[PDB]
Amino acid sequence: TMQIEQIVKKVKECSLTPEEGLELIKSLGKTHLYEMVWDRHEFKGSKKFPHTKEPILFFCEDDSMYTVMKRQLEGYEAPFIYVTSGERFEDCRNGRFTMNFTKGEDYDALCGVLRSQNIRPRHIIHFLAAGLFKNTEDAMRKQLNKSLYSLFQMFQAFMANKLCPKAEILYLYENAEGEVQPIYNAVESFLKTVQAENPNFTCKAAELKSMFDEPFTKQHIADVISFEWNNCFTCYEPRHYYKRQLQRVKKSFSVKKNGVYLITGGAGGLGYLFAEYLAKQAEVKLILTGRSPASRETAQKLSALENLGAEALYVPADISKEKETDALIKYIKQTFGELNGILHSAGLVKDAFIIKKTKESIEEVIAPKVFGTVWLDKAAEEEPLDFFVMFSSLSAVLPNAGQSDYAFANGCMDGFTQYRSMKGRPGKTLSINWPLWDAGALRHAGLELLSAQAGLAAFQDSMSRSASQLAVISGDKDRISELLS
Numbered sequence: 001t002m003q004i005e006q007i008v009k010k011v012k013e014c015s016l017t018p019e020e021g022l023e024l025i026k027s028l029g030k031t032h033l034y035e036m037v038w039d040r041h042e043f044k045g046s047k048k049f050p051h052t053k054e055p056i057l058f059f060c061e062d063d064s065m066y067t068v069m070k071r072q073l074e075g076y077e078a079p080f081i082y083v084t085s086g087e088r089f090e091d092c093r094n095g096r097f098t099m100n101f102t103k104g105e106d107y108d109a110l111c112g113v114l115r116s117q118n119i120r121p122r123h124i125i126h127f128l129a130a131g132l133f134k135n136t137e138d139a140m141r142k143q144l145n146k147s148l149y150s151l152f153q154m155f156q157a158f159m160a161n162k163l164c165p166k167a168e169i170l171y172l173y174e175n176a177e178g179e180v181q182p183i184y185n186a187v188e189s190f191l192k193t194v195q196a197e198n199p200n201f202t203c204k205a206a207e208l209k210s211m212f213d214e215p216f217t218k219q220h221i222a223d224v225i226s227f228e229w230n231n232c233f234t235c236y237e238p239r240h241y242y243k244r245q246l247q248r249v250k251k252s253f254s255v256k257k258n259g260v261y262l263i264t265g266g267a268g269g270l271g272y273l274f275a276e277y278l279a280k281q282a283e284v285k286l287i288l289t290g291r292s293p294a295s296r297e298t299a300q301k302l303s304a305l306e307n308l309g310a311e312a313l314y315v316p317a318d319i320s321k322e323k324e325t326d327a328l329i330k331y332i333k334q335t336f337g338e339l340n341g342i343l344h345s346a347g348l349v350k351d352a353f354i355i356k357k358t359k360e361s362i363e364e365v366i367a368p369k370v371f372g373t374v375w376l377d378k379a380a381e382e383e384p385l386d387f388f389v390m391f392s393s394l395s396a397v398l399p400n401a402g403q404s405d406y407a408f409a410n411g412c413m414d415g416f417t418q419y420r421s422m423k424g425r426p427g428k429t430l431s432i433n434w435p436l437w438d439a440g441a442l443r444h445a446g447l448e449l450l451s452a453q454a455g456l457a458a459f460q461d462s463m464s465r466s467a468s469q470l471a472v473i474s475g476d477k478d479r480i481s482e483l484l485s
C-alpha cells in the first residue's frame with residue numbers, strides 16, 4: 001500500500017509520466033536485489049584419497065606439486081598422471097607428460113595416449129592459474145591462457161575424445177591478502193556452465209589465498225585438494241575457508257547539471273534506455289560509444305537526447321582496443337574538460353555449447369567485458385568519476401547452457417570491482433548482474449522479464465546502496481529463493 005502511494009507521489013512530483021508509474025506498479029513484488037553473503041569455517045582436514053579408486057590427472061605449470069602429491073597419495077592404488085608445461089607434447093614415461101596448454105592438438109594427443117594406455121581419469125586437478133593480475137595486455141593474455149583458454153581446450157578435447165564418461169574437475173588458482181584475481185575468480189562462472197552443458201562433469205573452483213604470515217605451502221594445497229575430494233566455489237586460507245551465495249538485500253542518486261557521462265554500447269538497447277533516463281535527470285553531456293559508424297539511427301538517437309536537454313555525441317570506438325579507449329577518454333577530456341561517470345554496457349552474445357565454440361568466438365565475446373572494462377578503468381584513472389558502473393549479467397551466477405564465455409566475461413567485471421577498490425578509485429564502483437529485460441522456458445522457472453521501469457528503478461536503488469556487486473532478479477520471491485538454494 002505504502003509502495004503504491006510512494007509511486008503515486010513520484011508521478012505527482014513528475015519524476016515519472018503517469019504511464020511509467022503504472023508500468024512500475026504492475027512490477028510490484030517482482031523485482032528483488034541480491035548480494036553475495038559469505039559463510040566462514042575453520043579448515044579441519046579430511047581423509048587424503050579420492051572416494052573412488054580411479055586415475056587422477058593433474059595439470060601444473062611445473063613440477064612444484066609433484067613430490068607433495070606423490071607423498072599425499074602414498075598407498076593409493078590407481079595411477080597419478082602429472083602434466084607440465086613444455087614446447088611439445090611428450091609422454092615422459094610412467095605417468096608424466098609435457099604439453100603446450102594452449103594447443104588443442106596437444107590435449108588430443110594426451111587423450112589418445114591415455115586411452116591407448118587404458119588410463120581413464122576421474123579426478124582432474126587444473127592448477128596453472130598463478131601470477132599477479134596486472135592491467136596490461138600481456139599479463140591479461142597470459143592469465144586467460146592459464147585459465148579460460150586452457151580449460152576450454154581441455155573440456156573440448158575431453159568431450160571430443162570421450163576420455164571421461166564422468167569427471168570431477170577441481171580448478172585451483174592462487175591469490176594473496178591485499179590482492180585480487182578478477183580473471184581467475186571469473187572461471188567459476190565458466191565452470192558452472194560447463195556443468196550445465198555436461199552434467200557428468202562435476203566442476204569445482206578453489207582460491208588458494210596466502211595471508212601475511214600464513215603462506216599456502218605445497219602441503220596445505222595438497223590438503224585442500226584432499227578436502228575437496230572428500231566434501232561451485234570456495235575460498236581457502238590456510239586456517240579458514242569461506243563460501244558465498246546470493247541472498248536478498250536488507251533494508252538518492254542523480255547525475256549532475258553539466259556532468260559529462262560515457263555510455264559504452266550507448267546506441268544499443270540498454271545503453272540508450274539509460275541515456276534517455278540520464279538526460280531526463282539533468283542537463284548533461286552524453287557520449288555514446290559503439291564500434292559501428294554513425295548512421296541515420298544514431299543521429300535520430302542523438303536528436304531525441306538533445307530534445308531532452310542533453311548535449312550528445314556518438315563517437316565510434318572499439319573499447320576492447322587499449323589505444324582506442326585511451327583516445328576516447330582524451331577526446332572527452334579535450335572536448336568537455338572532464339569525465340564524471342561511465343556506464344559500461346558494451347557487449348555481445350554468441351551463444352554456443354562448449355563442444356561447438358571456437359577460440360575465436362570466445363575472444364569476441366569476452367573482448368568488451370574483460371579487456372574493455374580494464375581499458376576504460378585504465379584510461380580514466382585520473383578522471384574525477386562519480387561512478388563506474390558495469391552492466392553484468394545474471395548468467396555470471398546462474399548460467400545457462402551455451403553462455404560459458406559470456407558468463408565468464410560478466411563474472412570478470414564482477415571481480416574487477418575489487419581491483420578498483422584496491423586501487424582506491426574515486427566514486428562509486430558497481431557491477432549489476434542484470435536478468436533478461438523486456439526492452440531494447442523462464443515461465444516454468446517462476447521468473448519474469450524485467451520491464452524498463454522496474455530495471456531503471458533497480459538501478460536507482462542499487463546506486464544508493466553500499467554493495468559493489470548487486471544481482472537483479474525478476475519474478476516470485478519464493479521461486480527465486482529455491483533457484484538460489
Ligand SMILES: NC(=O)c1ccc[n+]([C@@H]2O[C@H](COP(=O)([O-])OP(=O)(O)OC[C@H]3O[C@@H](n4cnc5c(N)ncnc54)[C@H](OP(=O)(O)O)[C@@H]3O)[C@@H](O)[C@H]2O)c1
Nearest residue numbers: 265268269270290291292318319345346347391435436437
Ligand atoms: N538486454 C538484456 O536482457 C540483458 C541481460 C543481461 C545483461 N545485459 C547486458 O547489458 C548490456 C547491453 O545489453 P543490450 O540488450 O543493450 O545489447 P545490445 O543492444 O547489443 O547493446 C550492446 C552494444 O554494445 C556495443 N558494443 C559491442 N562491442 C563493443 C566494443 N568492443 N566497443 C564498443 N561498443 C561495443 C554494440 O554496438 P557495436 O556493434 O556498434 O559496437 C551494441 O550496441 C550488455 O553488455 C549485456 O551483456 C543485457
